[PDB]
Design a protein around this ligand. Sequence first.
Ligand SMILES: C[C@H](N)Cc1ccccc1
Length: 232
Amino acid sequence: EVQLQESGPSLVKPSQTLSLTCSVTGDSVTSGYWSWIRQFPGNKLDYMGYISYRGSTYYNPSLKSRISITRDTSKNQVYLQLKSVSSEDTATYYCSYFDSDDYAMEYWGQGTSVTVSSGGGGSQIVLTQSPAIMSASPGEKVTLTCSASSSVSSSHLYWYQQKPGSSPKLWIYSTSNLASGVPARFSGSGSGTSYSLTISSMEAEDAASYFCHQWSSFPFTFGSGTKLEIKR
Ligand SMILES: C[C@H](N)Cc1ccccc1
């Protein structure tokens, strides 16, 4: 019911501001949060901030004084502005909509590529996904793990699948709930600092990257990712 599309320049010189736009389309919305998320080369995902339905914003301490996220409800649009960019800000940037009442679904944009041609202070939970890389055969039972640096609520640990050329799709919510579009051969489990995704029977189509994610504690964070391959 919701489509998001990111725009802006794909190249930027350092110190310039980055300005991006999220043109949000489709169905009317009575609450929720529009978030910006960025993905580096090598695929580390970075939760930047959000603006809510009521104009409330939240920024990742790591960005604090460089970032602003604004709205233009009349133009049905959300914006990202980031000051003093450097090469470290080279990423694919995504906007995404989520309804706090609707745990089960998340909307992501296409994602825009942006290449780049201080204060803050905070703490974050680290999420570790090992192996970095896995090859299993058609038919094999596969288990993916996510270990957190401190406890998180099991209700706010989530998994995403992503495929080359495309954006993370929500795969599992609240530890063990599969999302729409996910075959029931997948499962999830765990509690405290230890979570896993399971595929009872690996199929060729399941090879992709998997990211766990935590939003039990601010800022939200993603795991380093397990890339899952097929054999032969
Ligand atoms: C990343 C979360 N699934 C989305 C979210 C959650 C809470 C607030 C804002 C956005």
